[PDB]
Amino acid sequence: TGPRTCKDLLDRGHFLSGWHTIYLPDCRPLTVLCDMDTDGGGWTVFQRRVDGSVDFYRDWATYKQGFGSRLGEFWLGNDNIHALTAQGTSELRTDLVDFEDNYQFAKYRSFKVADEAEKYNLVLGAFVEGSAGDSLTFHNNQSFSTKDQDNDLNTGNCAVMFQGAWWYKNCHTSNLNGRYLRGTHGSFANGINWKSGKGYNYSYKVSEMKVRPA
Amino acid sequence: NPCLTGPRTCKDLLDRGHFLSGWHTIYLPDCRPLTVLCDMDTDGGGWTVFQRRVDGSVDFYRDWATYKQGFGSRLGEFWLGNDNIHALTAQGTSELRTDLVDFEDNYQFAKYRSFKVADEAEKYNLVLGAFVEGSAGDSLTFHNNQSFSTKDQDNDLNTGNCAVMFQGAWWYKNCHTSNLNGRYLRGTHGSFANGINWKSGKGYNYSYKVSEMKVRPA
Amino acid sequence: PRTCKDLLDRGHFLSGWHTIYLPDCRPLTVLCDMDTDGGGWTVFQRRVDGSVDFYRDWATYKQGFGSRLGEFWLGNDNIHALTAQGTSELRTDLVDFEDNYQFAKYRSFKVADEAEKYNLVLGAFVEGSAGDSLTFHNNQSFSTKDQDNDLNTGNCAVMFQGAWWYKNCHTSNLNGRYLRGTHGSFANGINWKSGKGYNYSYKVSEMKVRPA
Ligand SMILES: *[C@@H]1O[C@H](CO)[C@@H](O[C@@H]2O[C@H](CO)[C@@H](O)[C@H](O)[C@H]2NC(C)=O)[C@H](O)[C@H]1NC(C)=O
Ligand SMILES: CC(=O)N[C@@H](CS)C(=O)O
Ligand SMILES: CC(=O)N[C@@H](CS)C(=O)O
Ligand SMILES: CC(=O)N[C@@H](CS)C(=O)O
Ligand SMILES: CC(=O)N[C@@H](CS)C(=O)O
Ligand SMILES: CC(=O)N[C@@H](CS)C(=O)O
Ligand SMILES: CC(=O)N[C@@H](CS)C(=O)O
Numbered sequence: 001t002g003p004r005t006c007k008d009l010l011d012r013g014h015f016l017s018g019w020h021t022i023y024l025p026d027c028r029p030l031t032v033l034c035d036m037d038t039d040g041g042g043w044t045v046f047q048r049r050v051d052g053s054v055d056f057y058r059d060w061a062t063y064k065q066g067f068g069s070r071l072g073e074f075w076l077g078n079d080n081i082h083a084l085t086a087q088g089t090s091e092l093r094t095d096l097v098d099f100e101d102n103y104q105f106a107k108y109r110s111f112k113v114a115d116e117a118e119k120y121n122l123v124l125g126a127f128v129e130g131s132a133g134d135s136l137t138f139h140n141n142q143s144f145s146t147k148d149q150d151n152d153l154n155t156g157n158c159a160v161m162f163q164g165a166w167w168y169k170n171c172h173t174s175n176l177n178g179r180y181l182r183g184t185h186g187s188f189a190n191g192i193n194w195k196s197g198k199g200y201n202y203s204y205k206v207s208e209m210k211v212r213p214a
Numbered sequence: 215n216p217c218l219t220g221p222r223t224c225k226d227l228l229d230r231g232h233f234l235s236g237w238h239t240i241y242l243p244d245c246r247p248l249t250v251l252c253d254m255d256t257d258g259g260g261w262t263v264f265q266r267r268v269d270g271s272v273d274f275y276r277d278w279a280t281y282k283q284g285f286g287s288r289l290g291e292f293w294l295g296n297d298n299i300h301a302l303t304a305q306g307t308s309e310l311r312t313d314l315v316d317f318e319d320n321y322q323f324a325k326y327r328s329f330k331v332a333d334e335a336e337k338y339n340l341v342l343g344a345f346v347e348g349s350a351g352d353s354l355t356f357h358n359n360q361s362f363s364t365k366d367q368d369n370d371l372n373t374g375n376c377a378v379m380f381q382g383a384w385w386y387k388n389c390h391t392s393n394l395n396g397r398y399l400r401g402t403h404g405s406f407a408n409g410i411n412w413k414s415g416k417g418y419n420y421s422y423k424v425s426e427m428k429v430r431p432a
Numbered sequence: 433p434r435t436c437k438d439l440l441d442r443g444h445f446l447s448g449w450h451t452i453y454l455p456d457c458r459p460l461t462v463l464c465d466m467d468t469d470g471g472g473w474t475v476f477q478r479r480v481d482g483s484v485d486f487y488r489d490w491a492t493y494k495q496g497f498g499s500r501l502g503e504f505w506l507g508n509d510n511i512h513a514l515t516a517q518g519t520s521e522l523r524t525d526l527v528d529f530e531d532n533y534q535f536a537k538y539r540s541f542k543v544a545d546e547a548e549k550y551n552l553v554l555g556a557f558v559e560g561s562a563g564d565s566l567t568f569h570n571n572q573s574f575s576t577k578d579q580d581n582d583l584n585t586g587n588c589a590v591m592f593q594g595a596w597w598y599k600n601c602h603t604s605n606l607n608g609r610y611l612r613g614t615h616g617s618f619a620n621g622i623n624w625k626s627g628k629g630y631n632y633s634y635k636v637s638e639m640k641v642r643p644a
């Protein structure tokens with residue numbers, strides 16, 4: 001048939017990382033970023049923060065379809081992300097870089113997101129390994145919330161209090177779609193924050209969330 | 215049959231459900247395929263970007279032939295080329311937006327009702343519609359209905375050579391008030407108006423960090 | 433389209449990833465430098481920011497590694513395939529941390545297949561402000577940390593943290609560590625000895641081929 005993941009492509013001898021066009025179960029094309037280097041390679045990347053050039057404080061319609069630049073930061077979009085994580089079993093990996101260049105990460109057994117009707121519900125496996133600690137199981141079975149759509153289990157607005165979008169609760173222990181605040185920041189838990197990573201007051205330089213059939 | 219069944223613009227591609235910026239190949243009026251950068255993010259999406267400065271890696275002080283055909287890198291800085299820019303904006307009405315960024319991460323912009331450049335025979339004459347809006351202020355209306363000039367081909371209205379004088383390439387009049395193809399001078403410079411300058415923006419003595427020029431069907 | 437020069441001829445004036453066809457007609461996406469010295473160069477190595485680790489083994493250099501988005505080594509099999517039929521000039525481009533440019537050029541450039549240990553076959557130096565720091569390495573095997581093929585009793589890949597056609601050991605070390613300017617450490621950076629010497633590591637390095 002044809003390539004359906006970055007796993008396929010790597011196996012087919014595409015060894016350099018970059019944008020490749022894979023085929024959704026639905027088929028229908030869809031060009032994605034492939035990380036062929038990290039942890040044996042073949043990861044499809046749906047989120048990337050690198051320099052704070054793209055504004056992530058976006059609404060529902062935008063997160064649905066995705067936004068950003070293949071040239072920089074981006075969200076692959078929730079419909080795509082669902083299509084992508086729906087049919088085998090993908091394992092999520094997160095990669096975080098502080099402004100020292102100390103890498104830290106988190107690996108998870110499985111990773112699925114429900115369709116838009118299910119509100120892009122997070123179905124997270126269990127923390128495997130990762131020097132950044134588990135700052136995401138906390139958000140299991142919890143709908144995705146955006147500025148123009150409050151779904152969080154909180155009386156106020158998590159998306160707005162911490163200026164981001166996430167599967168918020170009351171509210172978060174992770175906030176990778178938050179403000180790009182450049183290292184330690186006075187403001188509270190509103191940067192690119194990994195609770196168990198560098199706490200609620202440090203915003204990483206680099207954030208990447210990627211998948212790969214386990 | 216791909217000339218017939220492909221997209222004509224970055225707008226078409228947005229319509230067909232490409233929401234990420236990047237290089238897509240579109241088909242020009244003469245059926246010729248061309249790979250352009252689509253900015254799908256800014257002010258609505260569907261812009262075809264034709265110039266981009268960002269880090270000063272590419273040298274923009276080039277002769278006529280090179281501006282004609284295009285030069286640079288999809289990976290970074292670039293000019294799409296005068297023939298292409300003309301073919302883009304010939305049959306139809308396209309609006310132009312200018313995006314700018316300084317070294318303290320201020321974003322500004324300027325937008326224009328229409329934007330057309332003639333063919334080479336007409337020396338890529340600029341035909342600029344009215345200023346719509348922008349925090350950058352207007353620094354392009356001044357250059358309306360002027361020829362494009364390079365160092366090795368002078369078509370301005372200055373007794374001298376603007377392109378040489380201000381080390382760029384533009385629809386120079388006498389001489390300029392914007393100079394987005396000037397030297398990558400990195401913030402405030404001591405040299406006069408030879409940077410990537412937008413006069414109503416940060417004047418003749420500050421060169422921006424980023425510049426982008428893009429078109430969308432009006 | 434069989435090379436980047438073909439593509440330039442067909443009106444592709446911007447540098448970027450295009451897919452060409454290997455002489456056996458296998459497709460391969462390569463970086464085409466359409467700007468330098470007349471354009472048409474297929475790029476097979478690139479350092480620029482120090483984000484990729486170049487201190488790799490034989491398998492990894494054989495197949496290629498890195499990102500289209502940044503730094504990479506096209507892979508030895510591909511570099512062989514590319515320089516297999518005909519004659520290809522080599523250009524080495526170097527940029528320092530004051531943005532000064534230096535280059536080197538060579539009449540011809542060929543690397544043998546894996547059997548002959550990706551042996552280096554180089555033509556005459558023609559010119560370049562970096563000076564000739566590659567001829568010294570002509571007719572040598574490629575070495576990595578795990579497969580030592582040099583003419584030194586020790587391991588050169590390990591001694592100078594890179595991968596090259598090491599003799600005893602090197603006068604160029606472009607796959608060395610990204611050390612960022614002048615370094616006290618001896619000869620283990622992105623080093624071109626006739627250029628900035630054994631103690632300066634360049635900001636940018638590119639190695640490219642084009643039909644002669
Ligand atoms: C664009 O500029 C040209 C000159 O390059 C203008 O030409 C002049 O136009 C006026 C009419 O208002 C004539 O009286 C002059 O004699 C013309 N000079 C030349 C050299 O032809 C032209 O008018 C401008 N066009 C527009 C649309 O403003
Ligand atoms: C905004 C951005 O990240 N773009 C750069 C990243 S290297 C580019 O590829 O030109
Ligand atoms: C951020 C980046 O890479 N630039 C985009 C704007 S979203 C572009 O104009 O192509
Ligand atoms: C022909 C042209 O414009 N290119 C020149 C600089 S003017 C060059 O890079 O050698
Ligand atoms: C990215 C590349 O290979 N070349 C660029 C700058 S070196 C260019 O064509 O201007
Ligand atoms: C190329 C290289 O060194 N690879 C190592 C890990 S980086 C290996 O697992 O064999
Ligand atoms: C966009 C960019 O320059 N980053 C490269 C670094 S080698 C990458 O994504 O791998």
Ligand SMILES: [Ca+2]
Pocket residue numbers: 150151152153154155156157158
């Ligand atoms: Ca609420």
Ligand SMILES: [Ca+2]
Pocket residue numbers: 368369370371372373374375376
């Ligand atoms: Ca003049």
Ligand SMILES: [Ca+2]
Pocket residue numbers: 580581582583584585586587588
């Ligand atoms: Ca040895």
